[PDB]
Design a protein around this ligand. Structure first.
Ligand SMILES: *[C@@H]1O[C@H](CO)[C@@H](O[C@@H]2O[C@H](CO)[C@@H](O)[C@H](O)[C@H]2NC(C)=O)[C@H](O)[C@H]1NC(C)=O
Ligand SMILES: *[C@@H]1O[C@H](CO)[C@@H](O[C@@H]2O[C@H](CO)[C@@H](O)[C@H](O)[C@H]2NC(C)=O)[C@H](O)[C@H]1NC(C)=O
Ligand SMILES: *[C@@H]1O[C@H](CO)[C@@H](O[C@@H]2O[C@H](CO)[C@@H](O)[C@H](O)[C@H]2NC(C)=O)[C@H](O)[C@H]1NC(C)=O
Ligand SMILES: *[C@@H]1O[C@H](CO)[C@@H](O[C@@H]2O[C@H](CO)[C@@H](O)[C@H](O)[C@H]2NC(C)=O)[C@H](O)[C@H]1NC(C)=O
Ligand SMILES: *[C@@H]1O[C@H](CO)[C@@H](O)[C@H](O)[C@H]1NC(C)=O
Ligand SMILES: *[C@@H]1O[C@H](CO)[C@@H](O)[C@H](O)[C@H]1NC(C)=O
Ligand SMILES: *[C@@H]1O[C@H](CO)[C@@H](O)[C@H](O)[C@H]1NC(C)=O
Ligand SMILES: *[C@@H]1O[C@H](CO)[C@@H](O)[C@H](O)[C@H]1NC(C)=O
Ligand SMILES: *[C@@H]1O[C@H](CO)[C@@H](O)[C@H](O)[C@H]1NC(C)=O
Ligand SMILES: *[C@@H]1O[C@H](CO)[C@@H](O)[C@H](O)[C@H]1NC(C)=O
Ligand SMILES: *[C@@H]1O[C@H](CO)[C@@H](O)[C@H](O)[C@H]1NC(C)=O
Ligand SMILES: *[C@@H]1O[C@H](CO)[C@@H](O)[C@H](O)[C@H]1NC(C)=O
Lengths: 265, 219, 413, 50, 49, 50
């Protein structure tokens, strides 16, 4: 609002706790964004590792297991996904979890599934060979389990080709671009709203102040204050409405991670 | 004759550097694809809101303009001239020949016959565009000199015009003319209206393209 | 400061935004355009030959930068009177036109160049209106204008029918007219030429030696702007929060050498979202960037007043080199008052970018949180693990279903 | 002269009341989703085996 | 706000992008309504008889 | 408090909160949130002499 000037701060002090409320509102939003990520990804007790061999019954998981020749240790498909997506009091805080940590949670969820099926989601991880786990899952959809063992090679080839098609279909993510775009565009409007007079002589708190004397200037500075406070309330109310939509989405993601990754649905 | 501009008469609205930024402005511009008069070789024209003015030659037949409301005494006017020496801006009350010009011996200047009460002085093929405007007692002049590879026809292309001069005169203007060097031994006139444009800025800060936002639905 | 922000005497564990850190700039360095010319006074003053008193000159000074200080303090003038306006305030006002009149008179005739006088000079040679506005300047010129044998080239009018109107001029020579009589062009009884000549000599007492006079007359009218006082400046700096003014652009920040290239008519550059981020120095013509000065938020990390009263402080995103023991740099800012350890625990108080804090080792320490233990499944192509026992476990889950129903009465509030 | 001073209070108090009423709508929409989840857990964990 | 009056329209320009914001908000919830019924009813590939 | 003095006739408009001029600048300055009242009357016959 004011911004450096001192004639503005004493006038704005007359409005009560309007600015304390807005900072509380924005701080709650920022604390909720870390809990969103903790609820989706930190769904595992231990950090599980895959064994150095890769004898998985002919199934090939190399495009989705971590890449040891990288600082970030992401997988091939996680590398494809990451290449496709100071001011007047404004600040951006960093997330509590790095995305190295997030990639490390996801690789442990992956190694839990490939090595123990669904047992690590209900207690201690109990190893089972991958073809036998695949045969347990064929039973869960009502197919008899020799249909898997007599067709193992064909089933493994089909999995491998379908995994290969995903990178080509990747190298889509518009749902992740929309959030970034809407937020950047709503932050650009707040800054552009600072060059408007709102019905004062000018929109810059010095030229109003060095071309009039106090009784005359306080009138214009109150109009500037009113406009700039209205802009900030519009911004904060829309961030509150937009964060409740992101929370309903992270809640759906947590349920999917529980029910589709840690079990069979 | 009349002719069609294509994308002509774009000037930098002001100082302030700038790079790649489709910046949007409201100002007085020459609309795209306009109806520009054609003159050959001249008469008293109107002003009414700024003027675009191009010209083509290798010799120098166009030797400045003259401005004002009455182009005579009893009221003040501007006079911008160029003999074979250099530019001569001047602001007096004049008495202008109704057909004023300069010869080419090489003796000349049958332009006026009076120079009273001067309130401002100053002394010191081709396509030469100019934009003249007059706001709050300031008479602004933008200009650009591009080389054609023709002799005297209006070409096509984009070229933004850079500010040249600024004169705090106060003068009223309603009419203007031209000045030509006779024989003794082609020019156009657009007008400017309040439009809204979208200018594309380069990384060095020059205007490379534009969009007139009232031409058609696509724009 | 945390207790005051919360309005309490017991703060529970957490992290609280408490205030703000804003670097402070000093001095008001000014900038402008190289001191160009200073109005045209060359001829008008240092002329080699002045003008008579009966046909004075009249130069119409026009749009320019006039510096009446070089006049006022030159100490070479024997008379400098200002009437409409005292002299020191001339270099702070603007008019429409200045006229300068020039001539040469006797030494003791300089007191008739003033509003409301009489005498042979003010009656019919040069009359000043009664509400004059300008200033009158005069200096002795005995060595230039007086020559041995008498300089008979400086004339004045000594007969006229009627006194002049102010600023009126009369160069005629038609014979005069004494008592009633014809006198068709020819001197004689009661009748004679109207012009006399000072015969100036170098051996003439003061008050008989020639004085040169210049009368400046400021005449306002109306316009949008024109000449005015000369602005001052200083020597801009760099690498220091400063309060700057670049010929109109008022701002604050650190100034730094640039490597962009304006076009040679552009003064300052703007960003997207329209904030000034570069300027050009008016004197040296070099581009300088203006990055916002340091600033951010200050947070206080406390284990809770029911545990200890020690505290650590986070200076939101700011190199631990300009904050004003344990100073520790984080991707989230500069942390003061906690020591960095190499262990890794479960997160306690979240700092950011993978760093948490705790009250353990005491004091406050920093580090990188722990994702969790490390379990290694002994997977093989023919091994299975099967449980031999079980536990019955029971856990809780708490959920809000309602909140309080409130009503307001708009009018009564 | 008191009209001009009473209007300055009216505008402020209206603003504050309407801010209160917006933030309650946004907080009630969140309590509503929690109660909708509690109603599903009562059906699926208390009257059944999930 | 103004309703075909130029005196009011130029004074409305002194508040900036309030009306652009309002139209953008209202249009985004008109687009969401068609997505709403596409997500409920177009859950079948063929038109079976 | 009651303050008393004598000024010209057309200088009574500088006795008010937020003015400028030789009187309000440096003779008698009224704060910008004044509370009282200002009273003034002509006194030509008492204070002016031949
Ligand atoms: C798992 O699949 C990948 C393909 O995505 C295999 O890697 C490729 O193998 C072919 C030949 O089979 C090579 O031409 C490619 O250059 C390989 N791409 C790489 C290494 O990035 C990989 O070999 C498969 N795993 C196993 C155990 O066969
Ligand atoms: C303004 O004046 C200064 C001097 O008062 C000029 O500075 C000179 O710059 C040239 C560079 O071309 C140097 O060679 C001279 O030695 C400088 N003079 C001094 C006294 O330092 C400056 O160039 C002038 N401004 C412009 C635009 O020319
Ligand atoms: C012509 O007028 C000029 C301007 O008043 C006179 O100039 C100055 O002379 C003094 C010496 O007393 C110097 O200190 C100044 O620097 C000069 N001013 C300038 C040129 O800036 C000058 O004396 C006059 N003519 C002569 C030669 O007497
Ligand atoms: C299965 O686990 C239970 C414990 O949950 C074992 O029962 C415990 O046995 C120890 C030693 O005999 C006793 O000290 C405890 O009191 C028993 N617990 C309870 C709750 O009774 C049981 O022996 C285990 N069974 C097998 C086959 O290992
Ligand atoms: C320009 O306007 C004149 C007016 O009569 C018209 O005759 C002419 O066709 C117009 N030229 C173009 C290119 O539209
Ligand atoms: C060119 O024209 C100007 C107009 O007054 C004149 O002052 C100048 O002397 C001319 N050039 C020459 C060489 O005479
Ligand atoms: C302009 O010129 C005319 C005729 O030469 C003269 O009467 C008039 O006084 C002049 N204007 C001014 C402001 O002196
Ligand atoms: C220009 O002409 C108009 C005629 O309507 C007149 O009112 C105006 O005063 C003139 N400009 C100036 C600066 O006097
Ligand atoms: C100007 O722009 C061109 C192309 O945009 C670029 O190559 C060049 O480096 C820039 N600067 C110059 C020519 O000084
Ligand atoms: C708070 O203080 C009470 C009594 O002083 C103590 O019983 C309790 O353990 C304290 N809480 C913590 C977290 O230390
Ligand atoms: C802080 O500044 C120093 C000095 O340039 C630099 O070495 C350091 O890298 C900066 N901090 C960060 C986090 O880059
Ligand atoms: C933490 O371990 C690193 C190993 O690279 C060592 O260099 C560093 O000194 C250790 N820090 C402390 C505080 O001992």
């Amino acid at each position: 609002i004011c911004g450096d000037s001192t004639e503005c701060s004493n006038l704005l002090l007359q409005y009560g706790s309007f600015c304390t409320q807005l900072n509380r509102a924005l701080t709650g939003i920022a604390v909720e964004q870390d809990k969103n990520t903790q609820e989706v990804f930190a769904q595992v007790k231990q950090i599980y590792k895959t064994p150095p061999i890769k004898d998985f019954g002919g199934f090939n998981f190399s495009q989705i297991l971590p890449d040891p020749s990288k600082p970030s240790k992401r997988s091939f498909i996680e590398d494809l996904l990451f290449n496709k997506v100071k001011f007047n009091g404004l600040t951006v805080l960093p997330p509590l979890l790095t995305d190295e940590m997030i990639a490390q949670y996801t690789s442990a969820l992956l190694a839990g599934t490939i090595t123990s099926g669904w047992t690590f989601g209900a207690g201690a991880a109990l190893q089972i060979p991958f073809a036998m786990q695949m045969a347990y899952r064929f039973n869960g959809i009502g197919v008899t389990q020799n249909v898997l063992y007599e067709n193992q090679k064909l089933i493994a080839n089909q999995f491998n080709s379908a995994i290969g098609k995903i990178q080509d279909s990747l190298s889509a993510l518009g749902k992740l671009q929309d959030v970034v775009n809407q937020n950047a565009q709503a932050l650009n409007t707040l800054v552009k709203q600072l060059s408007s007079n709102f019905g004062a002589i000018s929109s810059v708190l010095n030229d109003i102040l060095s071309r009039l004397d106090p009784p005359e200037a306080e009138v214009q500075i109150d109009r500037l204050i009113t406009g700039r406070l209205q802009s900030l309330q519009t911004y904060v109310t829309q961030q509150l409405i937009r964060a409740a939509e992101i929370r309903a989405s992270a809640n759906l993601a947590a349920t999917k991670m529980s029910e589709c990754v840690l079990g069979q649905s | 004759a009349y002719t069609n501009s294509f994308t002509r008469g774009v000037y930098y609205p002001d100082k302030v550097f700038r790079s790649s930024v489709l910046h949007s402005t409201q100002d007085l511009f020459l609309p795209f694809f306009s109806n520009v008069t054609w003159f050959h070789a001249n008469p008293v024209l109107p002003f009414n809101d700024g003027v675009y003015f191009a010209s083509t030659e290798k010799s120098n037949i166009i030797r400045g303009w003259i401005f004002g409301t009455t182009l005579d005494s009893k009221t003040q006017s501007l006079l911008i001239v160029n003999n074979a020496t250099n530019v001569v801006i001047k602001v007096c009350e004049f008495q202008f020949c109704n057909d004023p010009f300069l010869g080419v011996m090489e003796s000349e200047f049958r332009v006026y016959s009076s120079a009273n009460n001067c309130t401002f002085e100053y002394v010191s093929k081709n396509l030469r565009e100019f934009v003249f405007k007059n706001i709050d007692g300031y008479f602004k002049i933008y200009s650009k000199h591009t080389p054609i590879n023709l002799v005297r026809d209006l070409p096509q292309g984009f070229s933004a015009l850079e500010p040249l001069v600024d004169l705090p005169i106060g003068i009223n203007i309603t009419r203007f003319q031209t000045l030509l060097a006779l024989h003794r031994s082609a020019y156009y006139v657009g007008y400017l209206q309040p439009r809204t444009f979208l200018l594309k800025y380069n990384e060095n800060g020059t205007i490379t393209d534009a969009v007139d936002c009232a031409l058609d639905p696509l724009s | 400061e945390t207790k005051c922000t919360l309005k309490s005497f017991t703060v529970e564990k957490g992290i609280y935004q408490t205030s703000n850190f804003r670097v402070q700039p000093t001095e008001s360095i000014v900038r402008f355009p190289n001191i160009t010319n200073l109005c045209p006074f060359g001829e008008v003053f240092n002329a080699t030959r002045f003008a008579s008193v009966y046909a004075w000159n009249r130069k119409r000074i026009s749009n320019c930068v006039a510096d009446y200080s070089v006049l006022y303090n030159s100490a070479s003038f024997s008379t400098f009177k200002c009437y409409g306006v005292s002299p020191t305030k001339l270099n702070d006002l603007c008019f429409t036109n200045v006229y300068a009149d020039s001539f040469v008179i006797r030494g003791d005739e300089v007191r008739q160049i003033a509003p409301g006088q009489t005498g042979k000079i003010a009656d019919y040679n040069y009359k000043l209106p009664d509400d004059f506005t300008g200033c009158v300047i005069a200096w002795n010129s005995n060595n230039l204008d007086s020559k041995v044998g008498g300089n008979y080239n400086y004339l004045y009018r000594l007969f006229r029918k009627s006194n002049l109107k102010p600023f009126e001029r009369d160069i005629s020579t038609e014979i005069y007219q004494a008592g009633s009589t014809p006198c068709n062009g020819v001197e004689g009884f009661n009748c004679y030429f109207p012009l006399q000549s000072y015969g100036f000599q170098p051996t003439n007492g003061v008050g008989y030696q020639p004085y040169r006079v210049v009368v400046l007359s400021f005449e306002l009218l109306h316009a949008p702007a024109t000449v005015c006082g000369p602005k001052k400046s200083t020597n801009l700096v760099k690498n220091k929060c400063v309060n700057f003014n670049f010929n109109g652009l008022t701002g604050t920040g650190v100034l730094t050498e640039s490597n962009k290239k304006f076009l040679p008519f552009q003064q300052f550059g703007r960003d997207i979202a329209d904030t000034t981020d570069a300027v050009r120095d008016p004197q040296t013509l070099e581009i300088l960037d203006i990055t916002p000065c340091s600033f951010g938020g200050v947070s206080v990390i406390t284990p809770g007043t029911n545990t200890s009263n020690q505290v650590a402080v986070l200076y939101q995103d700011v190199n631990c080199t300009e904050v004003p023991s344990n100073v520790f740099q984080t991707r989230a800012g500069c942390l003061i008052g906690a020591e960095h350890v190499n262990n890794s625990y479960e997160c306690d108080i979240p700092i950011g970018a993978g760093i948490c804090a705790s009250y353990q080792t005491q004091s406050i320490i920093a580090y990188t949180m722990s994702l969790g233990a490390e379990n290694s499944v002994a997977y093989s192509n023919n091994s299975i693990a099967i449980p031999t026992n079980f536990t019955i476990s029971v856990t809780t889950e708490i959920l809000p279903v309602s909140m309080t129903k409130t009503s307001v009465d708009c009018t009564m509030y």
